[PDB]
């Protein structure tokens, strides 16, 4: 089992013997989970850093509370002086609906578990020979470094 994911210095990095028995479906689901975790980690990086910078959208979220009035960090969602639970629940429901009605495979692009073409693409037809492998390695490495950095940021703001 040597595929995209052991790029850079060390090779098969399985100190715990995770893939001692192994199987194809377990392989695919683990890769999909790692990819999703990394993607959400880097998007949360963008959001957290751009909020710590000082930028804020105009307008109000609740009945008389602007986007720049909420605290920054963990206190936004939980703790005193947080966003109204109705608004947060509504946003969570909207995100769930978008996830369940947008990023599913309704055509049959298949290939890798995580591709949601459904006909729409920019240039993922002309390039073929080897850009796919190193691109996937790039996205995986970025996701892993993301997850590490975002866990560090969350713990730092918790202990800060």
């Amino acid at each position: 089992e040597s595929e995209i994911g052991a790029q850079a210095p060390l090779g098969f990095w399985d100190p715990l013997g995770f893939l001692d028995r192994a199987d194809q479906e377990t392989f695919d689901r683990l890769r999909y989970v790692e990819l999703k975790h990394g993607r959400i980690a880097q998007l949360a990086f963008v959001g957290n850093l751009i909020t710590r910078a000082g930028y804020h959208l105009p307008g109000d979220i609740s009945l008389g509370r602007a986007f720049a009035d909420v605290p920054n960090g963990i206190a936004a969602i939980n703790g005193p002086d947080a966003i109204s639970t109705a608004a947060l629940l509504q946003t969570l429901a909207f995100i769930g609906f978008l996830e369940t009605r947008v990023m599913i495979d309704a055509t049959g692009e298949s290939q890798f578990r995580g591709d949601f073409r459904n006909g729409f693409d920019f240039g993922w037809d002309k390039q073929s020979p080897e850009w796919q492998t190193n691109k996937r390695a790039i996205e995986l490495n970025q996701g892993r470094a993301a997850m590490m950095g975002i866990l560090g940021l969350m713990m730092h703001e918790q202990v800060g």
Partner: protein
Amino acid sequence: ENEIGVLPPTGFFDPAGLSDGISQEKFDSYRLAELKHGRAAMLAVLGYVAPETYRFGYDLIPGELSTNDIPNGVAAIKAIPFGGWAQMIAFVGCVETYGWFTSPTGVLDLPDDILAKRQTAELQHGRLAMLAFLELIRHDSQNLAQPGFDGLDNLITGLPFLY
């Protein structure tokens, strides 16, 4: 056109023709959605009455926030923090997506006619519970927005022996 869930109180009840032609898959999805909304409504109706007389003494937020103090009805969503709602939604999603905390011994081995009648009764009870939940929510919201409006006092206007 003709499947489970057609009983004589009326008979077809499709005035606006929401189905018309459709297909087998779309009809099956609609039936699944109706069964799901119905079961959820029945659970909601059952759970809207129990806390009025019984209360589990657990401290949602250890140290404070003890069930024994949170309001009942549509006012609990404001008192309960976002973390608990997220945790329970994730838990029910784990129940639904996976087979976790689910047992196939509840499918039973009933004959065909018994199964059909039981399914029809399930759908009827659920259809009733939907409107039950609607009325409960409307009364609670109207009373909370303006106390004294709709002068019938207390939650659950029926079952007056609770108070």
